[PDB]
Ligand binder design. Structure first.
Ligand SMILES: CC1=C(S[C@@H]2CN[C@H](C(=O)N(C)C)C2)C(C(=O)O)=N[C@H]1[C@H](C(=O)O)[C@@H](C)O
Ligand SMILES: [Zn+2]
Ligand SMILES: [Zn+2]
Length: 231
């Protein structure tokens, strides 16, 4: 079901949802996949996560313009690392309104990211304060607590069985939790379980670094995280 477009791969998940995949090329690293989402919300398109680079992100915009040809109303990025926020300048050059966790915007300069134009804040139960996420349509944004990073956020897509874990969630066969340099090893497992609880009807779990998985992804991530906590 994957389709190549330039150096990107797109996979349709639902009538109005596609996963975008881009691959990092510095000289020094493998071709590392990163996934995000494209959501058609009627007469506009919503983007979750940039690609690694501005150029790659501009390719995503060209795919959208060709294959959907509606205006991109907004992008939300799920934390301040390159694979999620590397393409902010391309979004801004295209005049797209960008949203991130307030904490992601505060971290951005230290991480080398361009901050999003707008800051999301969250209630104590983890749900985005809806004043800070105006006209998000089907995107249900949830901060599950610190895990992969302090600022990681997650997104459910209303009307579908899809929830997006970002880099918080790893696939049910993953051997490790990936990059833990910025991780909160005490709270990670609870944050993975909270994501599962926030979207209890989602049966397709989309994540940054593997194909869409079942809910087993969530329970396998929380286990690896608790193993890490107890060492
Ligand atoms: C580096 C990237 C990683 S670690 C990585 C992805 N899966 C890898 C792997 O070794 N597999 C065997 C699948 C290595 C992750 C991550 O594990 O979540 N994401 C990026 C970095 C990150 O998100 O922390 C970039 C954004 O700095
Ligand atoms: Zn990350
Ligand atoms: Zn990642």
């Amino acid at each position: 079901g994957d389709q190549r477009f330039g150096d990107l791969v797109f996979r349709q998940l639902a009538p109005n949802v596609w996963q975008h995949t881009s691959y990092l090329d510095m000289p020094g690293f493998g071709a590392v996949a990163s996934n995000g989402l494209i959501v058609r919300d009627g007469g506009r398109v919503l983007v979750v996560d940039t690609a690694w680079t501005d150029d790659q992100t501009a390719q995503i915009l060209n795919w959208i313009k060709q294959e959907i040809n509606l205006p991109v109303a907004l992008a939300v990025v799920t934390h301040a690392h390159q694979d999620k926020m590397g393409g902010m300048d391309a979004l801004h050059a295209a005049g797209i309104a960008t949203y991130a966790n307030a904490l992601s915007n505060q971290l951005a300069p230290q991480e080398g990211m361009v901050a999003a134009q707008h800051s999301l804040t969250f209630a104590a139960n983890g749900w985005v304060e809806p004043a800070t996420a105006p006209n998000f349509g089907p995107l249900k944004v949830f901060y599950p607590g610190p895990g992969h990073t302090s600022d990681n956020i997650t997104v459910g897509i209303d009307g579908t069985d899809i929830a997006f874990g970002g880099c918080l969630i790893k696939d049910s066969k993953a051997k490790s939790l990936g990059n833990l340099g910025d991780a909160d090893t005490e709270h990670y497992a609870a944050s993975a379980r909270a994501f599962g609880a926030a979207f209890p009807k989602a049966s397709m779990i989309v994540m940054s670094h593997s194909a869409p998985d079942s809910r087993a992804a969530i329970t396998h991530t929380a286990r690896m995280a608790d193993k890490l906590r107890l060492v």
